[PDB]
Each structure stands twice: as structure tokens, then as C-alpha cells.
Paper text:
RXRα interacts with different nuclear receptors to form heterodimers, thus executing different functions. The pleiotropic roles of RXRα have made this nuclear receptor an attractive target for drug discovery. Given that PPARγ partners with RXRα to form a “permissive” heterodimer, which can be activated by either RXRα or PPARγ modulator, it is possible that Rut increases the transcriptional activities of both RXRα:RXRα homodimer and PPARγ:RXRα heterodimer by activating RXRα or PPARγ. RXRα-LBD or PPARγ-LBD is reported to exhibit notably conformational changes upon agonist binding, subsequently recruiting its co-activator such as the steroid receptor coinducer-1 (SRC1).
Further target exploration research indicates that Rut functions as both a specific PTP1B inhibitor and an RXRα agonist that selectively activates PPARγ:RXRα heterodimer. Firstly, the binding affinity of Rut to the ligand-binding domain (LBD) of RXRα or PPARγ is determined using the surface plasmon resonance (SPR) technology based Biacore instrument. To study whether Rut is able to enhance the interaction between RXRα-LBD or PPARγ-LBD and the co-activator, the binding affinity of RXRα-LBD or PPARγ-LBD against SRC1613–773 containing the LXXLL motifs in the presence of different concentrations of Rut is measured. Subsequently, yeast two-hybrid assay is employed to further validate the effect of Rut on the co-activator recruitment. Considering that RXRα agonist 9-cis-retinoic acid could modulate GLUT4 promoter activity thereby increasing GLUT expression, we then test whether Rut is also able to increase GLUT4 promoter activity through targeting RXRα. Here, Rut is determined as a heterodimer-selective agonist. It activates PPARγ:RXRα but exhibits no effects on LXRα:RXRα or FXR:RXRα dimerization. Such a PPARγ:RXRα heterodimeric selectivity for Rut is expected to benefit its potential in drug development. Different from rosiglitazone and pioglitazone, the two members of thiazolidinedione (TZD) PPARγ agonists with anti-hyperglycemic activity, Rut could increase GLUT4 expression via enhancing RXRα-LBD/SRC1 interaction and PPARγ:RXRα heterodimer transcriptional activity through direct binding to RXRα.
Numbering used by the authors:
A (entry chain B), B (entry chain B): 1 to 10
C (entry chain A), D (entry chain A): 229 to 243, 263 to 458
Write the structure that this text describes.
Amino acid sequence: HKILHRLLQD
Amino acid sequence: HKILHRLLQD
Amino acid sequence: DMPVERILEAELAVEDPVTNICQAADKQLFTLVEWAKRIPHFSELPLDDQVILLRAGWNELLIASFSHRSIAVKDGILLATGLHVHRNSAHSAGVGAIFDRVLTELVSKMRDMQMDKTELGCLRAIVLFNPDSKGLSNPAEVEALREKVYASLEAYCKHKYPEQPGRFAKLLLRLPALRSIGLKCLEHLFFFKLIGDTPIDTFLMEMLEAP
Amino acid sequence: DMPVERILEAELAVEDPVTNICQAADKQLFTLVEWAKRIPHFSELPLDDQVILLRAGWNELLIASFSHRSIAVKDGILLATGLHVHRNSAHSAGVGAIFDRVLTELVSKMRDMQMDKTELGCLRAIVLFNPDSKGLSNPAEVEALREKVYASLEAYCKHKYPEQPGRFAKLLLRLPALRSIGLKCLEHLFFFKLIGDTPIDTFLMEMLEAP
Ligand SMILES: C=CC(C)(C)c1cc2cc3c(cc2oc1=O)O[C@H](C(C)(C)OC(C)=O)C3
Ligand SMILES: C=CC(C)(C)c1cc2cc3c(cc2oc1=O)O[C@H](C(C)(C)OC(C)=O)C3
């Protein structure tokens, strides 16, 4: 789930 | 819905 | 008025594994009608609205009942037929995913909080008085009855469990789980009907009819 | 601690019709992540649990938001893209049944009770902190946060609306409707994806991925 992870990272 | 009606009737 | 005493009375008055489950479901549908008649003010609703409410609510109502019945058993459900369905048996019949949801989201949570029979009865009465049910001649009347149930349930919870201020909300917040599980159980039932190699008795079959 | 002030802040910080709806959904998914980061203690959960919670909750979260956004409009929904979807347009696109459910079970009910933004935010925070979400490394931690939200929501309701003792329960009892509507909306989304003649953007598409 790359988009979600990236957005949550910061 | 004959069964339900009959059972609710009494 | 909506006394929790009358709601508990109603609960106490009525007290392939897929096949056994479906047979149990049909059996309990008869018992469900008698339960509902014992819920204060239900019998005084128009007959067509009684029909709508039970047709809308039967699966969640039955699911709540067998889930609470199963709190003292590990990795299984107790059917009203006296039959036990083990997690393993459910899994081996291809219905493991939904069975596990019942165990984790309902049974184990009812067990964890020691949901009592009055609370179960009230939750079931709330489900029964579903004002969102399509076709109701007077939704406001059904909304009113639901309000009376949860007013009474909260009072019961505050009096019986004053040490647990969040108990009332905790009870209500099992209802979304019950709704989703009910919907998935229905999906399976429609599939069993479609496939045709699971016996479905007359009352259960009637519930799978269109409005 | 779970202050309703911080939850309202989060709400205020983020403030073929099927195509427009899907485009709006994708857009709002980005905004949803930012909303969740502003919900107290969410960011301090393991990253994998943040992922699980948002993947489990996104549709209900988005549905709650557009439903409350639409309370001042008749027979329609307000998308965050600035676009309005009229009941007639939804019906004419073959999505009338689910659209009508949103209007009757969510929008009209939010309108009837004048659900405020703090209450909406708290309901959304409850949805977000879903301890039934599969794969959570610490469900008890998520359960704890949900408990904190509904403890705070109730306190808010008792203070702001002392004349409505049943308001708190009334708010929580929209959650089963939100759950069922969310599930049906998801079913439609999977169908639009399957059929292939509705553009679905990357984040929305990612949400339709398997775990
Ligand atoms: C195992 C899951 C599946 C999906 C097959 C499934 C289960 C299921 C279980 C029960 C039911 C209907 C069901 O429909 C289903 O599709 O009503 C029966 C109860 C309420 C137990 O009656 C008694 C005896 O109390 C319980
Ligand atoms: C009309 C119903 C159907 C079934 C087609 C349907 C509707 C639907 C609607 C919205 C959605 C996903 C949806 O999936 C659906 O399948 O997220 C969009 C919102 C939350 C509005 O983003 C904004 C702009 O706030 C709203």
C-alpha cells in the first residue's frame, strides 16, 4: 500500500 | 410472507 | 414505558455444520416471533410494520442470541438445537472467515465485558425497533420505541454497573459489528440457496424472499 | 486524554456523477490521512496499525464527512470538489438505491438532530479507532483510544445538550447505518472497478487492493 505508507510517513 | 403474518396474527 | 424487566422476561421465555446452522436458524425464527411479541409495544405496531421489523432484523437478532449463548464455550457456537459448531468444523465447511468474525467481534467481546441477559435483550430490542427499516408506516413511532429501549438500557447499566461509565456505549458499539456480520451471514445464506445443496426450511426460505 | 477540542480542530483543518464521486473520493483520501494525523494519539500508533485503521475505515469516514457536509442541501450531496450530486442525477446513473440510503439514514438524520462538527469528528474518530480491524498489533490500544473518544463525546453531549439525555446514544446508533452503507458503497466501487468504464484514481485504487 505504497501511497498510504508514504503519506503517513510524513 | 405467509408464515410470518400467520405467526404474528397469533 | 420500556421496563428492562419485561425485556429480560422475553429473553428468559425463549431460552455439514452449515445445514445444522440453517436448520437451527429456521427453528429460531419461530421462537423469534414469540420473543418479539413479548417486547413491550411491539404487538401494538401495525401488523405490516411488525413484519417489516422482523424481516429487517431477524439475522442480527438471531446472531446476537447465539453469540451470547456461546460465551461460556471456547472456539465454538452453541445452536438452540443443542448442537455445537466448533471453529474447526466451520473452517472445514468453508465458512471459517465469517465464523471467526462472530467469535472475535461478538462472542469474545460479550464474554470480555460479561454482557448480561438484560443487556443482550435490550440490544436485541434496539435492533428490532429499527426505524431505518424501509416501508415502515410510522418510522417515528419505531424511533420512539428504540429511544425508550436505550434510555432504559442506560439506566440499567448505570445502576447495575456504576463502576463502568463506558459500558452503555460499549454495548451499543457492538451493533456495527453485528450489522456487518449479519450482512455477511445473509450473503452466505443467499449463496447456499443459489447453489442448492444446502437444505433451507420454509421460514428461513421465506426470509430470503423479496419484499 | 482525548479532548473534543482537538477533534473539532481536525475537522475544521480539513474543511457520470459516479465518476465525479470517485474523483472526489480519491481527493479526500489524501485529506483523510491529514485528518487522522490530527486525531490525538493516532500518529503514535505503529505505522502498520495506522495503515490498517485507515484502510478499514476510509469509506465510512468519507461517507460520514460528505453526509454531514450535505445537511443544508435538499435531495443531494455536496462533494469536497465543490460539485453537487442531486438525487435525480444519482438515480439516473443507476446508483439511486444507495444514494437514497445516504440521504435518509445519514444526511436527514444528521439534519434532524443538528449533529454538530465536534460530534461528527468524534463519531469519525470512533470509526477510525476500530479495534475489530484485522491485523492490529495491539487491538487493546485501539479499543482504549475509542473508549477515550466516546467518553469525551458523551461528556461534550451532556454539557452542550443537557436537555437531550439520549443524544449520545442517538449519535452512536447512526454507526450501524454508516457501516451498512459503507459496505454497500464499497460493493459498488468494486463493481465500477470490475466493469472498467469508471475512472478510478491511484489512492482510491490502492484502497481497493487486497491486504
Ligand atoms: C457459519 C456462518 C454462516 C455464514 C454459514 C451462517 C451462519 C449462520 C448462523 C446462524 C444463523 C444463520 C446463519 O447464516 C449463515 O450464513 O442463525 C442460527 C442461530 C441464530 C444459531 O439459530 C440458533 C440455533 O440460535 C445461527
Ligand atoms: C452514489 C453511491 C455510490 C455507490 C456510487 C458510491 C458513492 C460514493 C460516494 C462517495 C465516496 C465513495 C463512494 O463510493 C460509491 O460507490 O467518497 C466520496 C466523498 C466522501 C464524497 O468524498 C468527498 C468529495 O467528500 C463520496
